[PDB]
Design an enzyme around this catalytic site. Sequence first.
Site, PDB file in Angstrom:
ATOM      1  CE1 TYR A  31      39.616  55.175  12.494  1.00  0.00           C
ATOM      2  CE2 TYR A  31      40.531  52.957  12.557  1.00  0.00           C
ATOM      3  CZ  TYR A  31      39.512  53.832  12.218  1.00  0.00           C
ATOM      4  OH  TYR A  31      38.363  53.334  11.630  1.00  0.00           O
ATOM      5  CG  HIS A  46      29.449  50.843  22.358  1.00  0.00           C
ATOM      6  ND1 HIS A  46      29.591  49.843  21.419  1.00  0.00           N
ATOM      7  CD2 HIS A  46      28.135  51.173  22.362  1.00  0.00           C
ATOM      8  CE1 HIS A  46      28.414  49.580  20.876  1.00  0.00           C
ATOM      9  NE2 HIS A  46      27.514  50.375  21.428  1.00  0.00           N
TER      10      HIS A  46
END
Length: 241
Positions: A31, A46
């Site tokens: 993560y 992104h």
Amino acid sequence: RESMRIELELQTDNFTVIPYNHQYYLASAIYNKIHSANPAYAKRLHNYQKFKFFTFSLLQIRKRVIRKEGIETIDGKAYLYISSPNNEFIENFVAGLLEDGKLRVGNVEFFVRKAKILPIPKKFNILKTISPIYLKTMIETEDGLKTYDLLPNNSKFYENLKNNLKKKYEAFYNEKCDMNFEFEVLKFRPKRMRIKNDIYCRCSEMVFKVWGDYDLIKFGYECGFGEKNSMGFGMVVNVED
């Protein structure tokens, strides 16, 4: 645009012990890489900050010694499998991991050496989990609504596993899932897995035969079976005949 599975080849010190409870720290590390401000990840990922259609395995050790606290890697090598029906996610994440070059899981520091490409099997027969399957349902109790963890000996497990996969298929592809599959559990063991600072769940380590529509099974193969795929649950591998 197709699926992709990679094997990340990791290297730490010889004789290092990977704790039995490492999955929680591994999930946190993955993560943190995906959501990192490091430009190695930031530009590449992104568009994937909320992307949940991927899975990854536990750390796998080949030259191993069973210890009290975990599995020792004699030569320092370990292998992490990561897959998605979205090959652009996998390619971008791998490029970032290779540029960064380091992955810390708990107290163990790995060098990220290479990423081996694993083409999808052309046929499926026996599958086994390389990260256990999580599958839950909510139930009313005298203490309020609680989460129940389904395992293969629960009557609801079978259809809930299938319906989870079909719903995920529609959520990922934005197309109707006009496909079906079936399976037979050959073996399973429950595993206690930490998923939140204080929540532990019961997940299934299991071996199972599958049949039905190849494209749907292939989606489970690269997305994961069950829930919380993107936290490292439900990844399977084919077992050679």
